[PDB]
């Protein structure tokens, strides 16, 4: 899967 | 500008309304108008700007990845339509990134005096150059990548000197810089080292925080942990 | 038209691509261009047209309801911004409805010779007048409501004469006409009677169907049942 | 809640 960047 | 005739406070109020209605294109247009009033943005206003454009470009990136995957499967002759539409979505994405970078350059970054606002806008600059790098294939791809790196790096230097290790914008900056290392710069070991060092030094600073600040910081630490589990 | 230079088949192909990318505004623009080529639409093409605009107007309706609720709570003096933004979203919604109704009037309905296509387009006409009626408050509100009713009623008369009771477009038409009765015409008993009669007569016709047609019909029957459970 | 119209 794709990694997590900042999300609200 | 199309929003030049509306009061700054009215644009902020309508941006919050657009967020409630999940109308993120309207939300971004309202905050662009607010920025173009020429005054600095409060913490809340900076977040509204960020949330609006992240949602707009987030839908464009997701669409671009769908079309790019279809295009790759087609090239493994059946018409130009897939490439054409992928190029259409790509160009629209680049337009939004260019718009955000224009707001940062004129003149959000140069007027950001405090470490908190300057790190915020430099993290934004790194993010949107990273989104440009995700679709880049031309002569300037390496310069786009280095533009992302340079903005992230200046923000990192400021955050390490002026902020505690649990500061949410410092944590989010390190998270996204690590994603840049892994996905864009092809530097997984640098990505892993940054995420681990950021998590550990935040963990050691939690004891200084209130319950409300603790919740904010541990939220972002969990995102760092999720990537570390994905990468190791 | 902005799509006048693109091949009909290319517009269809790109509409399917936009659906995969969840770019429903693009999908609607592509199908509008396809319709404006002047040729009749196949069953698959009619569904693409329907799905595209239903998604576009569905987001506008959901946003309008959020803003209308905020506006009602505010009137229970704090500035014109809420009304202004609700009016903005309302006007955009009406523009999309007017665009779809224009495609139906020029010239989809008049060229629909078969019962299957004519019922499809008349159900569309009823739906988009119903969406106009959801936001209507002026001198022509009763005429908007009757325009929805008149289109639904002609489609109902054709479907009862020319289609079996399990035909998916006949079932969907009756479902939406019943929603019109309940929510727009303030006729809950007519809504309940229509939904019950439609469900029962479809149930009695299921024995004639293949496994694939059975799945299609029971899907829509379940929506009729959901409303009957909500209304009784 | 609101009633169900046709959905795909
Ligand atoms: C990129 C990013 C990281 C963290 C946060 N964040 C989380 C909780 N509060 C905030 C926040 C809000 C506003 C602001 F100016 C700075 C800040 F850290 C938000 C973002 Br965007
Ligand atoms: C309004 C509506 C009701 C039913 C369906 N439906 C369900 C399964 N197939 C279809 C379908 C597709 C295309 C067409 F021309 C007619 C039709 F009934 C679709 C809609 Br829109
Ligand atoms: Ca002013
Ligand atoms: Ca042609
Ligand atoms: Cl295109
Ligand atoms: Cl407005």
The CATH number covering residue C37 comes to 1.20.190.20
**Ligand 6 centre distance from Cα of residue B106 (Å):** 25
Alpha-carbon distance C131 to C145, whole Å? 10
Residue at C2 is within a domain: no
C1 near C68, Cβ under 8 Å? no
User: What is the spatial distance between Cα B85 and Cα B76, in angstroms, rounded to a whole number?
Assistant: 18
Ramachandran bin of C170, using left for φ above 0, alpha for ψ from -120 to 50, beta for the remaining angles:
alpha
First to last CA, chain A: 19
Structural domain span for residue B231: 8-232
Instruction: Determine, yes or no, domain membership for B2.
Output: no
The verdict on residue C149 lying in a domain is yes
Q: Return the sign of the alpha-carbon dihedral for residues B110, B112, B115, B119.
A: negative
Helix axes C24-35, C43-74, angle to 10 degrees: 130
The DSSP secondary-structure symbol of B158 reads H
B128-155 exposure pattern, b = at least 16 Cβ within 10 A, e = fewer: bbbbbbbbbeeeeeeebbebbbebbebb
Are B191 and B178 contacting, i.e. CB atoms less than 8 angstroms apart?
yes
In Å, how far is C66's CA from the nearest CA of chain B? 6
CB B176 within 8 A of CB B123: yes
Count Cβ atoms below 10 Å from residue C79 Cβ, excluding itself.
12
Instruction: Round to whole Å and give the CA distance between B64 and B71.
Output: 10
Is there contact between D and C if contact means ≥3 C-beta pairs under 8 Å?
yes
Pocket probe mutation, ligand 1, options B51, B169, B221, max atoms within 8 Å of Cβ: B169
Resolution of the structure, angstroms: 1.8
Cα–Cα distance, B61 to B47 (Å, whole number): 20
B122 occurs within a structural domain: yes
CA trace torsion B4, B7, B11, B13 (10° rounding): -170
User: Which of C95, C103, C140, C158 minimizes the C-alpha distance to C125?
Assistant: C103
Return all residues near C197 (Cβ < 8 A) that are at least 6 apart: none
Structural domain includes residue B171: yes
Per the structure, how many domains does chain B have? Answer: 1
What does the alpha-carbon distance between residue B15 and residue B27 come to, in Å, rounded to a whole number?
5
Please state how this structure was obtained.
X-ray
Residue C1 located in a structural domain: no
Nearest-CA neighbor of C131 among C123, C139, B209, C120? Answer: C123
For residues B123 and B173, the answer to whether their CB atoms sit within 8 Å is: yes
Tell whether B15 is covered by a domain: yes
Prior bond of C107 cis (ω within 30°): yes
Ligand 1 centroid to B47 CA: how many Å? 6
3-state secondary structure chain C: CCCCCCCHHHHHHHHHHHHHCCCHHHHHHHHHHHHCCCCCCCHHHHHHHHHHHHHHHHHHHHHHHHHHHHHHHHCCCCCCHHHHHHHHHHHHHHHHHHHHHHHHHHHHCCCCCCHHHHHHHHHHHHHHHHHHHHCCCCCCHHHHHHHHHHHHHHHHHHHHHHCCCCCHHHHHHHHHHHHHHHHCCCCHHHHHHHHHHHHHHHHCCHHHCCHHHHHHHHHHHHHHHHHHHHHC
Measure the CA–CA gap between B119 and B107, rounded to whole angstroms.
15
Which is the closest atom of ligand 1 to the Cα of B173? 1
Q: Which two tokens stand for residue C91?
A: 């006007």
Nearest CA to ligand 2 atom 14: C43
Within chain B, strands assigned E span none
B36: three-class secondary structure by DSSP: coil
CA atoms of B176 and B183, how far apart (whole Å): 10
> First-to-last CA distance in chain C?
48
Find the helix or strand (DSSP H, E) in which B188 lies. Answer: helix B188-203
**Who's near C173: CB < 8 A, 6+ residues apart?**
C119, C122, C123, C126, C152, C155, C156, C159
Six token digits for residue C26: 């693009």
Q: What backbone phi and psi angles, to 5 degrees, belong to B22?
A: 55, 40
Residue keyed to tokens 């999940």: B22
Using DSSP's 3-state secondary structure scheme, residue B153 falls into helix
Question: Does C213 map to a domain?
Answer: yes
Buried b (16+ CB within 10 A) or exposed e, C1-17: eebeebebebbbbbbeb
């Amino acid at each position: 899967r794709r990694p997590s960047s900042w999300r609200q | 500008g199309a929003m030049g005739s509306m009061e700054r406070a009215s644009l902020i109020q309508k941006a919050k309304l657009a967020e409630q209605a999940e109308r993120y294109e309207d939300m971004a247009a309202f905050m662009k108008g607010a920025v173009e009033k020429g005054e600095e943005l409060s913490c809340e206003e900076r977040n509204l700007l960020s949330v609006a454009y992240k949602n707009v470009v987030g839908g464009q990136r997701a669409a671009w990845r769908v079309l790019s995957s279809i295009e790759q499967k087609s090239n493994e002759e059946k018409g130009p339509e897939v490439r054409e539409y992928r190029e259409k979505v790509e160009t629209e994405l680049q337009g939004v990134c260019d718009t955000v970078l224009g707001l940062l350059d004129s003149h959000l970054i140069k007027e950001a005096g405090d470490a908190e606002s300057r790190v915020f806008y430099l993290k934004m600059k790194g993010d949107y150059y990273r989104y440009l790098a995700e679709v880049a294939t031309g002569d300037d791809k390496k310069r786009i990548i280095d533009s992302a790196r340079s903005a992230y790096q200046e923000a990192m230097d400021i955050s390490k000197k002026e902020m505690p290790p649990t500061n949410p914008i410092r944590l989010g900056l390190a998270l996204n810089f690590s994603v840049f290392h892994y996905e864009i710069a092809n530097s997984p070991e640098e990505a892993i080292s940054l995420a681990k060092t950021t998590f550990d030094e935040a963990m050691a600073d939690l004891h200084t925080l209130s319950e409300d600040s603790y919740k904010d910081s541990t939220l972002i630490m969990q995102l760092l942990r999720d990537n570390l589990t994905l990468w190791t």
